[PDB]
mmCIF file of C-alpha atoms in Angstrom:
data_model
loop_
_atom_site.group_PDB
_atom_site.id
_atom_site.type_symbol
_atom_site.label_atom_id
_atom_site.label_comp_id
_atom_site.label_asym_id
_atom_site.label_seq_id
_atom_site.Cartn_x
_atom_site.Cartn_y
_atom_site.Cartn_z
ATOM 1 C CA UNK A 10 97.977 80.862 159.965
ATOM 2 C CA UNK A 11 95.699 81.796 162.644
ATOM 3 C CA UNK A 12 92.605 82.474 160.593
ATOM 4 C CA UNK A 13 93.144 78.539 159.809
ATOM 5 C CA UNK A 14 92.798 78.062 163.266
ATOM 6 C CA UNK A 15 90.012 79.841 164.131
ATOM 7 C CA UNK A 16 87.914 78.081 161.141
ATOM 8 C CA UNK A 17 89.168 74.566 162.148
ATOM 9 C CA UNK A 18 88.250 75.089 166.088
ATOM 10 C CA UNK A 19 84.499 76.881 165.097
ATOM 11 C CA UNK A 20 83.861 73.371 162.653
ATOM 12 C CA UNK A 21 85.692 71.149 165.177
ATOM 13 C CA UNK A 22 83.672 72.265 168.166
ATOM 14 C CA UNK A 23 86.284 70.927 170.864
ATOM 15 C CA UNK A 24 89.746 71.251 172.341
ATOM 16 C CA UNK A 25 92.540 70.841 169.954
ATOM 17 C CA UNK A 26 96.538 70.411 170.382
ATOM 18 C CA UNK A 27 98.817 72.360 169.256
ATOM 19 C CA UNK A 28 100.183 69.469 167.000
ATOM 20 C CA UNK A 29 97.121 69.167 165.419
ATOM 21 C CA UNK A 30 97.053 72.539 164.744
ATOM 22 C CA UNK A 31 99.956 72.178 162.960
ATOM 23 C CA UNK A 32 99.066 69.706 161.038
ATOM 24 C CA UNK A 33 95.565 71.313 159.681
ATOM 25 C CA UNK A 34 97.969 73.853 158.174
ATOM 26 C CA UNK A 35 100.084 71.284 156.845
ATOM 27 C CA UNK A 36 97.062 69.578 155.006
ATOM 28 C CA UNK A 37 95.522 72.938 153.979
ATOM 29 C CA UNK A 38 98.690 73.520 152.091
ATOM 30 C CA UNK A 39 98.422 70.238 150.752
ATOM 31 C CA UNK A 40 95.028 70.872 150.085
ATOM 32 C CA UNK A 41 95.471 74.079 147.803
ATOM 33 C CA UNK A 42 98.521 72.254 145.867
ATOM 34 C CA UNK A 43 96.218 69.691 144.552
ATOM 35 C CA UNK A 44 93.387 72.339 143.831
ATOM 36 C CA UNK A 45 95.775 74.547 142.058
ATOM 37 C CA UNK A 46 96.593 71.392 139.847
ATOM 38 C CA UNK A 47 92.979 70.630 139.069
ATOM 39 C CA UNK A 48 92.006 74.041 138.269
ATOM 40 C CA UNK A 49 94.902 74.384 135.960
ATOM 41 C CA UNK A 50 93.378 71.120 134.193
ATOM 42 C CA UNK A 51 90.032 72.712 133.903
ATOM 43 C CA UNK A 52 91.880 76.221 132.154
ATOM 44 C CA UNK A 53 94.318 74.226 130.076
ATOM 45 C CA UNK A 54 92.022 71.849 128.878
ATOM 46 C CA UNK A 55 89.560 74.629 128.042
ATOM 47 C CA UNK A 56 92.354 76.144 126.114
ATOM 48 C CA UNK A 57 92.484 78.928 128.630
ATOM 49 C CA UNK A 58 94.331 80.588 131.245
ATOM 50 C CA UNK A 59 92.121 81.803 132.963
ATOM 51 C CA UNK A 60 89.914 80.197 136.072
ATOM 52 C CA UNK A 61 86.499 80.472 135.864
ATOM 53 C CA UNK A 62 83.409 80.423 137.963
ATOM 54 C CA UNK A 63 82.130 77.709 136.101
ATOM 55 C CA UNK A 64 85.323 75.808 137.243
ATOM 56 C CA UNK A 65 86.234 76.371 140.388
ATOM 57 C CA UNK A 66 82.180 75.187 140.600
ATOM 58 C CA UNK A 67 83.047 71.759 138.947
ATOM 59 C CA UNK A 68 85.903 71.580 141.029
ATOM 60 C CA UNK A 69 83.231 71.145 143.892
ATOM 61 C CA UNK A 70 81.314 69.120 141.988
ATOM 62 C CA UNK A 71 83.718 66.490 141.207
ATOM 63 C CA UNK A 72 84.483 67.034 145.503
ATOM 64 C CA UNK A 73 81.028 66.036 146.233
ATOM 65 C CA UNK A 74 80.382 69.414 147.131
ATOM 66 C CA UNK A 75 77.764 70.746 144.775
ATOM 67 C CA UNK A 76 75.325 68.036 144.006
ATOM 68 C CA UNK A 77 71.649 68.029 142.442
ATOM 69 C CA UNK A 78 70.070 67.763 145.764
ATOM 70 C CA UNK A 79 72.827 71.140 146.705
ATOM 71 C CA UNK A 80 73.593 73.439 143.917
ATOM 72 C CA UNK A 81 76.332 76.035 144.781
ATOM 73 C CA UNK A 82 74.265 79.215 145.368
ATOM 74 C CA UNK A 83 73.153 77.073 148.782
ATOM 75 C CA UNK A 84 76.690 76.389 149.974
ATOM 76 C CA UNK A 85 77.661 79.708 149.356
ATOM 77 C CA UNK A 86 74.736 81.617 150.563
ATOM 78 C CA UNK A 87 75.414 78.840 154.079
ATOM 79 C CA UNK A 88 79.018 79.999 154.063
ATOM 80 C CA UNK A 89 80.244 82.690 152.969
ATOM 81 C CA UNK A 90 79.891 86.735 154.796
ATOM 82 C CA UNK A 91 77.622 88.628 153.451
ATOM 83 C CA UNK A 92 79.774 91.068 151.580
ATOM 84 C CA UNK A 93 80.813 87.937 149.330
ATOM 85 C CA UNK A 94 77.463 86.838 148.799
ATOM 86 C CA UNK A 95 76.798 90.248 147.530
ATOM 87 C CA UNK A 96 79.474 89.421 144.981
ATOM 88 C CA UNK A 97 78.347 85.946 144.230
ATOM 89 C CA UNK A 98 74.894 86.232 144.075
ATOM 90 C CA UNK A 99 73.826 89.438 143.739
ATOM 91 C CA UNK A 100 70.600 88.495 142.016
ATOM 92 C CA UNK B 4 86.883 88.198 156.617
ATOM 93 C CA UNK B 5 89.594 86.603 154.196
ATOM 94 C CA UNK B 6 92.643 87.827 152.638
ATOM 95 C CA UNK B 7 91.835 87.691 149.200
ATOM 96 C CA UNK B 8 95.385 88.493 148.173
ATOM 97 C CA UNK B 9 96.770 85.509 150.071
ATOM 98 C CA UNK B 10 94.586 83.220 148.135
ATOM 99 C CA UNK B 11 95.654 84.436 145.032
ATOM 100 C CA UNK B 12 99.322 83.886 146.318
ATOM 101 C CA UNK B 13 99.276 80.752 147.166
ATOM 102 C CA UNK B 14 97.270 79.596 143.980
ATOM 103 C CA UNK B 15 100.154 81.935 142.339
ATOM 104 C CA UNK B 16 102.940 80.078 144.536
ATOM 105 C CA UNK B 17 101.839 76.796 142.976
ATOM 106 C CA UNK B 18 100.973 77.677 139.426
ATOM 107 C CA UNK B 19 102.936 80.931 138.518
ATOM 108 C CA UNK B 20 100.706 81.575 135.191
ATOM 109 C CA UNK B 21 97.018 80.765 136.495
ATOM 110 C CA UNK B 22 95.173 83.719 136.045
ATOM 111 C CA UNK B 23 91.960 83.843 138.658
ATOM 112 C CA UNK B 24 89.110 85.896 137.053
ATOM 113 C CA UNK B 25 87.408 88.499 139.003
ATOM 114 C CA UNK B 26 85.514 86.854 142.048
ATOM 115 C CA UNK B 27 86.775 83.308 141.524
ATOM 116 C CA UNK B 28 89.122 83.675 144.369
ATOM 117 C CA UNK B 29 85.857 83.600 146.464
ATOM 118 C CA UNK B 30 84.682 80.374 144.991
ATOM 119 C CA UNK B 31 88.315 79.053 145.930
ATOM 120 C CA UNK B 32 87.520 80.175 149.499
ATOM 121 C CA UNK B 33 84.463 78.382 149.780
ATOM 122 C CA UNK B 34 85.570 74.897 148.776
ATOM 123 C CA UNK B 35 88.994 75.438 151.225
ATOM 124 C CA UNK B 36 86.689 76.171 153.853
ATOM 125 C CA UNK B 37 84.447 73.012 153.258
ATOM 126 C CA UNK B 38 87.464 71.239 152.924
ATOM 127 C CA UNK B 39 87.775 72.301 156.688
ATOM 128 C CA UNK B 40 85.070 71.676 157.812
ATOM 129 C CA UNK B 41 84.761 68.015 155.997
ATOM 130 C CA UNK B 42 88.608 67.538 158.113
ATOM 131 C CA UNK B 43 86.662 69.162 161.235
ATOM 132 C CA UNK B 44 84.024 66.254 161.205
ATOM 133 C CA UNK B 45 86.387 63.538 160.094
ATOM 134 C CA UNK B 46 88.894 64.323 162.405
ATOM 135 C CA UNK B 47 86.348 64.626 165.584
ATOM 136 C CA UNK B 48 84.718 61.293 164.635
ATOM 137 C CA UNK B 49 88.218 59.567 165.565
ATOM 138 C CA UNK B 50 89.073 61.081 168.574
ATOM 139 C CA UNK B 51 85.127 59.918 169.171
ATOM 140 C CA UNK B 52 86.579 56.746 168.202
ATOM 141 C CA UNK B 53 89.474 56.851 170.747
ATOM 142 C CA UNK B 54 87.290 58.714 173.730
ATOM 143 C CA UNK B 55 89.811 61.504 173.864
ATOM 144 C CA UNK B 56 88.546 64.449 174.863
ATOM 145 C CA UNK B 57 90.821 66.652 172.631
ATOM 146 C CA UNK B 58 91.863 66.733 169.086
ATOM 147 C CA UNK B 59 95.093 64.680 168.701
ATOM 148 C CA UNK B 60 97.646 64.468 165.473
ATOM 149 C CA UNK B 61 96.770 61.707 164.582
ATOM 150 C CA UNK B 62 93.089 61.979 164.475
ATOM 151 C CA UNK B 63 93.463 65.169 161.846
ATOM 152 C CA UNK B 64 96.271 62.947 160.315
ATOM 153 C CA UNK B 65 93.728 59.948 159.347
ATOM 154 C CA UNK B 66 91.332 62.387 158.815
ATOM 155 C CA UNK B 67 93.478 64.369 156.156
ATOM 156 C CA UNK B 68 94.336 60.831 154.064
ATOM 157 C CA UNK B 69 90.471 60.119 153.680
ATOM 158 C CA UNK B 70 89.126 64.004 152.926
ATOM 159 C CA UNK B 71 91.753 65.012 150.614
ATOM 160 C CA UNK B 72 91.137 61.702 148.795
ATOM 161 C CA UNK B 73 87.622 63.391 149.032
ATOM 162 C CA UNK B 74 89.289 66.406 147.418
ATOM 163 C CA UNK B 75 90.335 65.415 144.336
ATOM 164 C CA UNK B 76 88.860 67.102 141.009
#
């Protein structure tokens, strides 16, 4: 949607086609297809159905997201509103 | 802002019996919107790499194959 657009133009810092555009949704959708399949590993394989924090936190992990030199609380206290931080890490 | 419910949709849409607990969905967020970001920088450095001044298909197209093979859990 247009939110997509917004986020990808405020990272991308310059001009960007329509096209292109088009295709960030494309990928995104691609993106949370392969996601959903991971995170239903993680559940499944803890003999759950439910997603966890502890999970979706991996998930990062194993993205090269969280790291020991950048533990979660960092990324999401870096990017995420307020009023979800509140929820994250409210301590 | 974010529309939780959309999230929880879409992760719905692809696996019908995934239950998210309470503020995972936020988590889920997060690592879409590094994901963008990661396809942001990726996709900038080639149309660096062709001196075009704007962001073309194909640059976000190359740039897709290399960050979600970044993506994978």
């Amino acid at each position: 949607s247009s939110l997509i657009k917004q986020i990808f133009s405020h990272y991308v810092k310059t001009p960007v086609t329509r096209d292109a555009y088009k295709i960030v949704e494309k990928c995104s959708e691609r993106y949370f297809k392969q996601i959903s399949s991971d995170l239903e590993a993680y559940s499944q394989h803890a003999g759950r159905k439910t997603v966890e924090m502890a999970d979706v936190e991996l998930l990062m992990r194993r993205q090269g997201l969280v790291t020991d030199k950048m533990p979660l609380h960092v990324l999401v206290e870096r990017h995420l509103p307020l009023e979800y931080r509140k929820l994250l890490i409210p301590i | 802002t974010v529309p939780r419910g959309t999230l929880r949709k879409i992760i719905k849409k692809h696996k019908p019996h995934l239950r998210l607990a309470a503020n995972t969905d936020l988590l889920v967020h997060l690592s879409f919107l590094l994901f963008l970001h990661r396809l942001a920088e990726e996709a900038r450095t080639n149309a660096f790499e062709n001196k075009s001044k704007i962001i073309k298909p194909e640059h976000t197209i190359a740039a897709a194959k290399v960050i979600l093979k970044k993506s994978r859990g």
